[PDB]
Write a protein that binds this ligand. Sequence first.
Ligand SMILES: Nc1ncnc2c1ncn2[C@@H]1O[C@H](C[C@@H](N)CC[C@H](N)C(=O)O)[C@@H](O)[C@H]1O
Length: 248
Amino acid sequence: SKTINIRNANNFIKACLIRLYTKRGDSVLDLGCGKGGDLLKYERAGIGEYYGVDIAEVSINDARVRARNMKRRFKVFFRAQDSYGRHMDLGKEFDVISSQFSFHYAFSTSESLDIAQRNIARHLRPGGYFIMTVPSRDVILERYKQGRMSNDFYKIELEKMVPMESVREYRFTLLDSVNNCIEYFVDFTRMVDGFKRLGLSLVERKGFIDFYEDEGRRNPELSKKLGCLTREESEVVGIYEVVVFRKL
Ligand SMILES: Nc1ncnc2c1ncn2[C@@H]1O[C@H](C[C@@H](N)CC[C@H](N)C(=O)O)[C@@H](O)[C@H]1O
């Protein structure tokens, strides 16, 4: 693959995010878990329980097979359902709720973002954390203004016609990944506010490149266990940001 380093970075970043906010015996709710790659990261993290939820039943399947054939200490649970725009109640809270590269899908409509925020808040133990990695609207528009919105690895198109600050969705393509996939912008303020009203407060917001470099010059061990990036790959990785809220 040509995307390898980008995948390596992204996973590295995720593993770090997981290292920072998880502890042994912790309970995790993975929203938009996808095929379930993070299972390993969590297994190293030493958590005691993993609940994967994802609208795509095809992906849950993969995660089931994944969990079924891996070396893991934690118990697992999986469910194919919409955890953002449809009420969700699992009957229990979690120490940590994670949404990796998926929460922006919660922004389809004001109603949808709401149902999602409520679902998040009702499955989170008081004091617990809600970690995520979402595309940065601010970054995406500034690149828009710079004129460059693509390279050999990806492409982005704004569903415009009409202020760019008024645009709420765009098309995303990633080499060896999604194709012309439609994404919703993350209305950051509206998000923060909703969560605020729900008892969750913002405790962290940092970009992929800096966070990467920082955590990198912080433990060169997991790194080598990585490398450097080309300006091109860095543009892809430079799209996302880390965002954490905590239930107080
Ligand atoms: N409304 C939704 N409810 C639950 N999962 C969703 C929803 N919309 C999209 N998704 C999932 O979001 C996932 C996003 C993928 N980028 C996630 C990959 C995985 N979390 C990773 O970190 O590699 C897809 O697998 C979808 O099935």
